[PDB]
Symmetry: C3
Subunit: 387 residues, 3 copies
């Protein structure tokens, strides 16, 4: 700072701190990484084991979640909505994107054996974050004996739940419970973490085997659904987006999402986000990508493989070529309506330039300019063979 | 302790003003916005004391302003950019009385006059961190007439210079050429070494009342009416609120307010704002309050009394409890429609939790889980006592 | 001073460029945004000075851009993400013959005011006789800049061997176009062209800079016969579209968002004015915007007063100089040369000016007894201060 975005290297990142819990593990990326600090965001991935519950929490930041693996239940709770009688539970499965306003509590539960992987971007720079430039979870139940290790200056003390901060008597008089039941909720010394294992069953919602001024608004949608893809060249792959126009609640989150499933040796044409920072998380497979900054320098050139995260701040241009049989990723963008501009193909900035600018710009023939401008016939996905 | 970890607060205190500007007919008492706790919120706070017949001379600010008449009565006038000009004719001049909450856009001149016999106390927040403030993380009052000898003692770079009105700024000649007046008269507009300050005694007659696209819609509203409040249990007290729905102009100011009046032992159930930083000011009486971290630490716990400010960042939880005969406060929130979330009661976040989440979460019985979820039937206010 | 007291300013100065990028056929003169005075306003400023036959090559920015053409005439090309191809180009001698499809190439003349979304690429050409001078504000503070407190050109073609000299720790590394950053091979696979040709695209070592001499037939328009097709250009030298037009004194014209709806997204606003010697623009401030003032013609004497009541500028300001005026600072300006002409760029889609003197004065809206008890003057003297000036914004003096 105040040059946070003068980036000379990008590296494909993995988590920095790992909260080990009883039934899975929260894994958090270091938002102090220059590249994340440039993005404005942190990243975290829940890994949830069988019979595991991610206990209710809420954040100071808009959140956008993508369930990368397995399936389960997610539970939302807001102010004023119509709340055994609880607010609505939901079946979540792989490909589902999930939007949360700041201050909204959410829990997740895994029923199966396949681990439930949920992957999330916390938007730190948004005005909606009226605190701080760290990810700040507020736990309603779990105790976190490791403490806030993702936030420096913590000095190695535990992070108890919200209820622990109150005296047990004021709790008692508030909930109308016994002072000893009050203390129970404080989960003092509780070793489990925030992903706890459920004893007995979880008759939360019955899966029927039968089959703003928007509190009714829907906050889930599936991205793996090619019916709704922005592009579908079945031989190459599909890319799918999530706009304000698909979930109105996003206009306010200022957040967006893209899903991509491509096949070995398919190339995503070189592009840049006109109005958003990206953060790209690989779901399945590996691709070879190059990234170019404002100085025309190559800030990244390498494989990006599953579980990894690459930051693509506004204006940086990327080019991706699948290496593995198939490659499936998800990009999170800091704009409720992210715009892409391609540098190649039939909708490229170059394509919209007059030939004569192209020849004089590159000091090349008029015919060569004609080639570079018209040859690549595809819009966003093309073939390619090599390394 | 400071940016960009501005909000890793580990203690709060009841805050009093740190600087008193002394004027002829009253004072202007201003809180320290360098205080970690107030910097975290992005607001400053200032209190006027206008003695009888005193006039707060016209200032405008760089920042949204949300004022509250804590006690007294008097007149007050705005001067919006060239509106309805209704032998003297001048813009609207309204009366104001305790309870009144006044909105001011950046750039709008405001003045106050105590036409009554008891002291006029206006108490008001400045939204520093808002994007409407295109200056500085600083209260920056621009004075139309008031000369102030103590100078900007609330900004760090001052160096003890005196702070003169705007007119003082131009050469008296140009001031003459512009208002089309005698240079003599011009110089007199500059109030050099007028020591009165900004709150002056008026002389003789004060017979004023005589003759985005909103020079019309309302900018004032009274919160001391228990019949237009949100919850009014006469047993306990009332809490009334000023939303953008109430005063549609707040949509722009990004500021809401909340007014509380509760009697002894009345308790305001543990709550947090999902989407607003708050500044609580005690107008009458004394309450005992607790506040909780995202670490689940008690960062406050103690008495907060008349004339004090307690800063409550977004996501911190707060239980209030009247200690005096009657306790009356005013909450200022950085959101044109703040959203409270309750940790206990019929609106609680725990209400909208499936019981098996509550039970497993805190490791308590199902009997215990059904109480913790249901016993408290009240929404916001409640008696300080349990089973 | 410095953040978060970036606006404790005690002295402002008429400013000029602080670095120059000299190109084959023109130069980019860029202002210093690290100047305390410019840092407060949260913007940078730049002037393209384009020679004849001179092409300024396609660049896109990470922030909003509001351009003004101060001197000259020429062509401009915008290119948005995924739009149809408007214009068409005759092919001179046709074999295999094809013409050219491409975005709309507009003509620009002095007074045109252009708007650019972050991510939009633009190039300028001087078909004209004299030098073409475009002047531009870049909105650094705006939420739309996802990057940094610096202006960041992204160059599609031009090489800049001087590098990013306007940013701090660049250490004299050259600045290549975007294409240079990809291996020639991937570029070839992407453009389905020969790897030897992909090398050429990277303009490695090209020392022309970003404004080049166009050799030959720049025949770019042959015969002319939710908002993707909104209006983004407009001419402020057109007095039929002015807020105030006193033809003895001069005019002030304005680009609110009520004129260019796309501005409500850019969070930017403009104000062009022409006044004649000794005309005065009554003391005003901006209620909700930071201003940046550029003189395009002549001289005027201005005073700027801050919130401490001090005079932070009091002097001459002439052609090519820029004066920063933060929200709340109050400004008076008297024309001094035969006629004074200037362009203000405000940091609000719709800017509210508040006058201290005249028919809309802030004082005009005060009760007499506040004016009289305030400055301690005569009730008669108050009647005067409040009413004597009947003009709103413009007036004559000496």
């Amino acid at each position: 700072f105040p040059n946070e975005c003068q980036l000379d290297q990008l590296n494909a990142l993995e988590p920095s701190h790992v909260l080990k819990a009883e039934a899975g593990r929260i894994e958090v990326w270091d938002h102090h990484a220059p590249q994340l600090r440039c993005s404005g965001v942190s990243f975290v991935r829940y890994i949830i084991e069988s019979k595991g519950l991610y206990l209710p929490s809420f954040f100071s930041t808009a959140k956008l979640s993508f369930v990368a693996k397995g399936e389960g239940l997610m539970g939302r709770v807001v102010p004023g909505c119509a709340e055994d009688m609880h607010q609505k539970v939901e079946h979540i499965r792989t490909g589902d994107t999930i939007a949360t306003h700041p201050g909204v509590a959410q829990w997740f539960y895994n029923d199966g054996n396949q681990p439930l992987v949920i992957v999330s971007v916390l938007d730190l720079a948004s005005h909606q974050n009226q605190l701080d430039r760290n990810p700040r979870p507020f736990y309603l139940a779990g105790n976190n004996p490791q403490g806030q290790v993702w936030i420096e200056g913590r000095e190695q003390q535990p992070q108890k739940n919200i209820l622990n901060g109150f005296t047990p008597e004021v709790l008692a008089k508030a909930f109308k419970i016994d002072v000893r039941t009050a203390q129970q909720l404080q989960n003092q010394q509780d070793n489990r973490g925030n992903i706890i294992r459920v004893q007995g069953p979880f008759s939360v919602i019955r899966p029927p085997l039968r089959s703003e001024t928007i509190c009714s608004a829907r906050c889930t949608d599936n991205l793996d659904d090619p019916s709704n893809a922005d592009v579908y060249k079945p031989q190459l792959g599909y890319i799918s987006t999530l706009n304000s126009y698909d979930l109105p609640i996003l206009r306010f989150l200022r957040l967006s999402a893209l899903r991509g499933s491509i096949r070995q040796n398919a190339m995503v044409l070189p592009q840049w986000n006109a109005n958003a920072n990206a953060v790209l998380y690989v779901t399945d497979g590996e691709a070879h990508v190059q990234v170019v900054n404002d100085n025309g320098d190559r800030v990244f050139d390498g494989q990006v493989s599953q579980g990894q995260l690459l930051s693509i701040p506004q204006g940086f241009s990327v080019v991706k070529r699948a290496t593995s049989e198939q490659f499936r990723w998800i990009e999170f963008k800091t704009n409720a309506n992210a715009q892409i501009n391609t540098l190649a193909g039939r909708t490229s900035v170059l394509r919209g330039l007059p030939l004569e600018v192209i020849s004089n710009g590159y000091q090349i023939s008029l015919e060569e300019a004609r080639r570079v401008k018209f040859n690549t016939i595809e819009t966003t996905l093309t073939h390619s063979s090599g390394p």
